[PDB]
Amino acid sequence: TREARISRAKRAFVSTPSVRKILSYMDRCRDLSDLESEPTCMMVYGASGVGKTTVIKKYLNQAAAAAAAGGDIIPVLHIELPDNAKPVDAARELLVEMGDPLALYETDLARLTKRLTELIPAVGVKLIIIDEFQHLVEERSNRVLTQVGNWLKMILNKTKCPIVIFGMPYSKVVLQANSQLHGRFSIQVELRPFSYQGGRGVFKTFLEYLDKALPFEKQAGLANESLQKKLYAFSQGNMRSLRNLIYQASIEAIDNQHETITEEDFVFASKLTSGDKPNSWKNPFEEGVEVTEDMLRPPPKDIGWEDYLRH
Amino acid sequence: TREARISRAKRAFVSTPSVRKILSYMDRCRDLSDLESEPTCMMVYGASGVGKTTVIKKYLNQAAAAAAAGGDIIPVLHIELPDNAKPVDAARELLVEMGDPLALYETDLARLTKRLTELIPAVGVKLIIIDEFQHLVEERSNRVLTQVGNWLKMILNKTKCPIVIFGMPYSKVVLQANSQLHGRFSIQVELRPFSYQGGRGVFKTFLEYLDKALPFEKQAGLANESLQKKLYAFSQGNMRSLRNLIYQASIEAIDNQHETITEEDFVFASKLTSGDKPNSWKNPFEEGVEVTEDMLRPPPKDIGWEDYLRH
Numbered sequence: 213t214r215e216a217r218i219s220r221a222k223r224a225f226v227s228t229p230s231v232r233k234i235l236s237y238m239d240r241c242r243d244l245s246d247l248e249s250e251p252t253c254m255m256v257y258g259a260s261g262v263g264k265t266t267v268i269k270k271y272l273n274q275a276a277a278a279a280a281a282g283g284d285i286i287p288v289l290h291i292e293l294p295d296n297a298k299p300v301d302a303a304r305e306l307l308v309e310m311g312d313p314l315a316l317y318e319t320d321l322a323r324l325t326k327r328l329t330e331l332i333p334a335v336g337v338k339l340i341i342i343d344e345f346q347h348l349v350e351e352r353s354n355r356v357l358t359q360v361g362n363w364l365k366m367i368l369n370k371t372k373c374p375i376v377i378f379g380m381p382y383s384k385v386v387l388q389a390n391s392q393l394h395g396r397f398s399i400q401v402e403l404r405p406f407s408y409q410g411g412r413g414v415f416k417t418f419l420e421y422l423d424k425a426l427p428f429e430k431q432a433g434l435a436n437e438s439l440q441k442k443l444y445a446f447s448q449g450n451m452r453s454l455r456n457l458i459y460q461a462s463i464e465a466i467d468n469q470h471e472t473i474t475e476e477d478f479v480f481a482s483k484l485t486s487g488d489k490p491n492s493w494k495n496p497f498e499e500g501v502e503v504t505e506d507m508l509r510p511p512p513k514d515i516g517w518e519d520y521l522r523h
Numbered sequence: 524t525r526e527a528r529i530s531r532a533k534r535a536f537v538s539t540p541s542v543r544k545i546l547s548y549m550d551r552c553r554d555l556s557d558l559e560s561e562p563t564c565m566m567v568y569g570a571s572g573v574g575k576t577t578v579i580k581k582y583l584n585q586a587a588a589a590a591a592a593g594g595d596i597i598p599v600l601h602i603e604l605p606d607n608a609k610p611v612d613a614a615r616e617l618l619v620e621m622g623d624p625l626a627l628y629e630t631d632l633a634r635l636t637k638r639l640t641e642l643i644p645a646v647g648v649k650l651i652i653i654d655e656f657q658h659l660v661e662e663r664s665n666r667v668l669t670q671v672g673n674w675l676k677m678i679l680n681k682t683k684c685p686i687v688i689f690g691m692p693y694s695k696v697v698l699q700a701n702s703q704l705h706g707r708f709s710i711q712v713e714l715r716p717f718s719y720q721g722g723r724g725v726f727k728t729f730l731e732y733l734d735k736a737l738p739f740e741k742q743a744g745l746a747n748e749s750l751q752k753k754l755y756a757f758s759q760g761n762m763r764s765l766r767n768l769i770y771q772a773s774i775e776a777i778d779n780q781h782e783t784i785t786e787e788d789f790v791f792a793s794k795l796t797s798g799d800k801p802n803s804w805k806n807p808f809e810e811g812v813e814v815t816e817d818m819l820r821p822p823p824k825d826i827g828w829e830d831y832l833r834h
């Protein structure tokens with residue numbers, strides 16, 4: 213098995229230009245906010261499985277590895293909002309995250325704000341990052357709760373720490389609720405999936421950078437004339453499922469004697485990870501499924517919005 | 524009676540490949556976690572009576588027999604969470620378990636964390652194992668409490684000891700509560716019951732290894748053409764009830780003159796241990812009950828989830 217090759221095949225990262233555009237903007241946000249005056253407050257979108265958490269873990273690596281190895285400073289922070297977040301609920305988890313506090317046996321929402329606003333200059337927080345903004349909409353109706361939104365405006369105007377919010381593409385109507393939240397968050401971006409399969413794409417260079425990143429030491433055989441056809445036939449532009457199927461083929465090749473990912477084990481990888489796909493999506497690998505041109509069609513605009521049509 | 528034969532008939536263990544897969548993964552977790560950097564933190568599932576406690580007692584035998592006979596080291600630990608566990612409640616029982624402390628007349632949850640984090644390198648804990656993770660969901664509603672979850676993340680990030688959590692299959696939504704708990708627990712497995720009765724199963728080899736493991740010195744007569752039919756008719760794939768009925772037949776055979784388990788005393792064993800079964804489950808042994816093919820049907824996916832539908 214040689215589990216080093218397995219973990220080294222799973223932990224692989226390809227920097228598409230949108231990702232480095234993002235990380236450049238967050239360093240821009242980090243040492244552009246001067247902690248004297250009003251911050252910049254970027255907002256990042258992206259659908260399910262487009263690489264968001266990988267982006268922020270890249271960011272806390274390249275921004276906080278040496279400063280977390282040096283001492284208890286914690287300049288950048290990483291937060292997910294729990295579902296249907298009460299303002300005291302999000303505030304207390306954001307508080308027990310940073311520092312070494314006890315911090316949550318009292319739930320009073322004024323005195324823990326006191327403790328968090330005295331601690332946010334005490335350890336020297338350079339940036340606060342929130343992962344999951346779509347948790348503030350109701351399940352069965354599309355009312356949105358902005359107790360946490362006005363609380364986040366309060367902690368923004370209290371201490372001038374920059375905030376970078378990630379979230380689903382349907383989570384922006386929450387920002388359409390509070391207009392002061394809408395104006396305070398100026399930079400919204402678009403981390404949409406891979407667009408086309410027609411040729412000379414960013415998809416190409418991503419694919420062959422992943423190919424040299426793979427643990428097989430000669431060639432992976434991928435990013436070819438017909439392979440990206442069935443690859444884009446399998447995953448829409450969907451980064452998580454593409455990488456998942458690729459990893460599930462790579463483990464199958466390293467289970468036995470195999471020199472590269474080839475045409476006997478990539479099929480069984482299509483057999484496993486075909487579960488999340490819809491019924492009208494077509495299964496292209498086993499016996500005779502040639503792929504029409506309309507099925508490599510680019511992803512629509514409401515690609516991170518199908519959590520929202522039904523209600 | 525000859526109670527040696529009774530205890531030697533009760534304490535019998537058959538290593539199906541999923542069990543040795545597990546124990547290989549926990550030795551992998553034990554001396555893969557280096558106690559310098561971030562651990563691996565496996566999670567194990569399994570329904571009621573699938574052999575979990577037997578697996579961990581096998582593990583503390585084969586991992587800690589000689590080191591517990593040598594001195595007070597206690598490298599591996601065994602913990603069950605009490606029901607509706609307060610963080611101080613789970614922490615104090617995890618504390619009085621290891622070492623020889625007094626440890627629970629104070630319930631302060633900061634200073635006992637102090638004592639436990641100075642003691643976890645003092646005795647040299649190699650691994651902490653928790654049995655019962657399903658105790659953190661509410662009875663009447665499906666709110667889950669994650670005071671203990673964030674406390675377990677705290678003790679995970681404080682000292683870098685690997686943690687192996689066992690639990691019910693419906694207990695994974697608790698891990699879906701905290702996303703940092705979800706990401707910190709990477710390896711989740713599937714200890715599901717025995718799948719089919721159709722032939723050439725793992726069930727076969729398990730059955731005849733149990734047959735040679737039985738105290739009768741010629742043959743047990745089991746694992747035959749028609750016996751596994753009524754065996755899988757009695758127990759679904761359910762290891763506890765299968766082993767229980769087998770033991771209740773073996774005691775009945777050794778109560779009087781009997782040379783093997785046979786067709787007069789195995790019936791009375793079906794008479795006793797038919798209580799836990801549902802009403803629509805069919806009782807197949809007494810007079811004329813031939814078993815249809817649909818009743819050897821494989822167990823469903825929500826087989827460890829019927830504690831969860833009603834609320």
Ligand SMILES: Nc1ncnc2c1ncn2[C@@H]1O[C@H](COP(=O)(O)OP(=O)(O)OP(=O)(O)O)[C@@H](O)[C@H]1O
Pocket residue numbers: 222224225226227228231258259260261262263264265266267451452455
């Ligand atoms: N730039 C990249 N290069 C290689 N693999 C990537 C890249 N970005 C993401 N992946 C893969 O995609 C998978 C999904 O990542 P991630 O969870 O960050 O997406 P996401 O949009 O945050 O999904 P979710 O929002 O549901 O968490 C990861 O397992 C990772 O291996």
Ligand SMILES: Nc1ncnc2c1ncn2[C@@H]1O[C@H](COP(=O)(O)OP(=O)(O)OP(=O)(O)O)[C@@H](O)[C@H]1O
Pocket residue numbers: 533535536537538539542569570571572573574575576577578762763766
């Ligand atoms: N590999 C095995 N070989 C033989 N017997 C076994 C094996 N595994 C389990 N058993 C039998 O199954 C019974 C139930 O064991 P165990 O309690 O570990 O299951 P469990 O899933 O932990 O149940 P619970 O979770 O309710 O404690 C035991 O009495 C044991 O005799």
